[PDB]
Amino acid sequence: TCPFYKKIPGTGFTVDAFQYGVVEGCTAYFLTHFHSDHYAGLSKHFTFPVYCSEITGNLLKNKLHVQEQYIHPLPLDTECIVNGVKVVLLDANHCPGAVMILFYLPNGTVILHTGDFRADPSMERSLLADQKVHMLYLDTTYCSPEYTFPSQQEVIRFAINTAFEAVTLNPHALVVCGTYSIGKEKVFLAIADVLGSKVGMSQEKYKTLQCLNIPEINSLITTDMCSSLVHLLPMMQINFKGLQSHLKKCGGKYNQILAFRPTGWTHSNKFTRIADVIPQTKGNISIYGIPYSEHSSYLEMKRFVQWLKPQKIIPTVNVGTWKSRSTMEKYFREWKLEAGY
Ligand code: NI
């Protein structure tokens, strides 16, 4: 059954709750972003209102074939009324089109649901600064102190210099980037840009990217593999066997592959810096795992919550075990005592 942490009290609203059939009493289904665990269950046959960003609406329409009449896109940073309740969508700094949702209840309670986010100090100067939030439904993916990672900007710097150097030393080297959802487009676009190439990908992925309102996107991507030296592949195909295989397909246009696997966290984050990363090399094929996160680090999460000073925190990730739940509740209490709310 639909868990309590997907229901918004005092409304008939649910968030990211599409895989439970009809939810008894739900008059409006919100979708924070187009990632499969969150949209799981949506299809062309859904006949309830879906509220979401414009970008997520383009993807529902063109990728899922949900009918236009059930998609209600809302602009960001705008007070809107939905079934008699004031709501605001804010940028989540996650993947394209991803949002947080502010709900202003008739009783006067204010609730923020973060969806998936990477907390940033820029959020402290959004519409959130304007009033008190009583309840926070929080993305707790990395709610533990071991979870450190560098800034997105540092990680992109690294990838750009690595690729530029490899290709300038060997003009017959191919760059491959792995992907399995939207998110992390900066990795492959920043690389394409330093190398004066468009990025090349399958027809399905090209269609996916054309939904995302990226400015000048026609100048940056293509379906013509042959004309491009940055290729996107399924993340599943990013391994020695999958790359060798792929190398054959280019017909001796390239003799070397430099590939990037943009991971989340991996335990080498607890030891090594970005400057000191190394690849796995089997011959003329090298694979970098880069820790490009679109979720809050433990410290970024801690700062956001200490700034927000919520009265109650409801976790939306890692809720399935008593040990995780108990651990998260300990960190929340530490934060609250340190900050005095
Ligand atoms: Ni996500």
Side-chain angles (χ1 to χ4, degrees), residues 163 166-167 170-177 191 195 197-198 200 225-233 243 246-247 249-250 253-260 284-286:
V167 156
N170 178 197
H172 310 276
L174 174 56
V175 181
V176 178
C177 285
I191 287 169
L195 294 184
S197 183
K198 290 202 195 192
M225 300 301 270
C226 279
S227 61
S228 180
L229 53 141
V230 192
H231 298 174
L232 305 192
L233 289 183
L243 290 171
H246 179 75
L247 193 47
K249 275 161 259 167
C250 310
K253 201 173 194 303
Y254 311 111
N255 46 30
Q256 176 182 5
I257 270 171
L258 186 107
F260 290 95
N284 61 343
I285 286 165
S286 278

Side-chain angles (χ1 to χ4, degrees), residues 31-35 52-56 59 76 89-101 113-118 123 182-183 212 294:
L31 180 60
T32 60
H33 65 290
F34 198 76
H35 279 164
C52 58
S53 63
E54 192 193 330
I55 284 154
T56 297
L59 293 159
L76 303 192
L89 303 192
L90 305 173
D91 200 285
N93 187 39
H94 184 51
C95 66
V99 296
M100 317 188 290
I101 316 165
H113 193 304
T114 68
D116 282 350
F117 87 145
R118 180 164 188 176
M123 296 172 175
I182 67 168
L212 302 186
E294 291 184 342

Side-chain angles (χ1 to χ4, degrees), residues 222-240 242-247 249-269 271-281 283-293:
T222 165
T223 54
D224 185 4
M225 300 301 270
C226 279
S227 61
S228 180
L229 53 141
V230 192
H231 298 174
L232 305 192
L233 289 183
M235 198 75 69
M236 275 197 66
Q237 203 178 334
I238 316 296
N239 54 72
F240 296 121
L243 290 171
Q244 287 160 186
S245 181
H246 179 75
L247 193 47
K249 275 161 259 167
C250 310
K253 201 173 194 303
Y254 311 111
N255 46 30
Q256 176 182 5
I257 270 171
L258 186 107
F260 290 95
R261 290 189 345 99
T263 57
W265 168 91
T266 59
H267 187 48
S268 18
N269 260 297
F271 301 120
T272 311
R273 272 164 161 74
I274 193 71
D276 328 335
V277 173
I278 67 133
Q280 273 189 235
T281 304
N284 61 343
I285 286 165
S286 278
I287 301 176
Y288 289 77
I290 52 170
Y292 195 88
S293 188

Side-chain angles (χ1 to χ4, degrees), residues 42 98 102 152-153 184 190 199 229 232 246 267 286 288 302:
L42 267 170
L102 259 186
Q152 291 176 166
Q153 195 278 328
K184 307 197 200 190
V199 182
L229 53 141
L232 305 192
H246 179 75
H267 187 48
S286 278
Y288 289 77
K302 181 180 188 276

Side-chain angles (χ1 to χ4, degrees), residues 37-48:
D37 290 358
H38 299 261
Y39 65 70
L42 267 170
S43 81
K44 75 166 68 166
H45 309 298
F46 202 80
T47 51
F48 297 108

Side-chain angles (χ1 to χ4, degrees), residues 117 119-125 136 138 296-310 335 338-339 341:
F117 87 145
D120 192 79
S122 62
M123 296 172 175
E124 299 158 23
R125 296 166 283 277
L136 178 60
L138 180 63
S296 312
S297 73
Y298 171 86
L299 292 173
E300 293 163 350
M301 188 184 306
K302 181 180 188 276
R303 183 194 158 118
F304 180 77
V305 171
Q306 286 180 317
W307 175 79
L308 191 70
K309 305 184 168 63
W335 303 347
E338 178 192 30
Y341 53 98

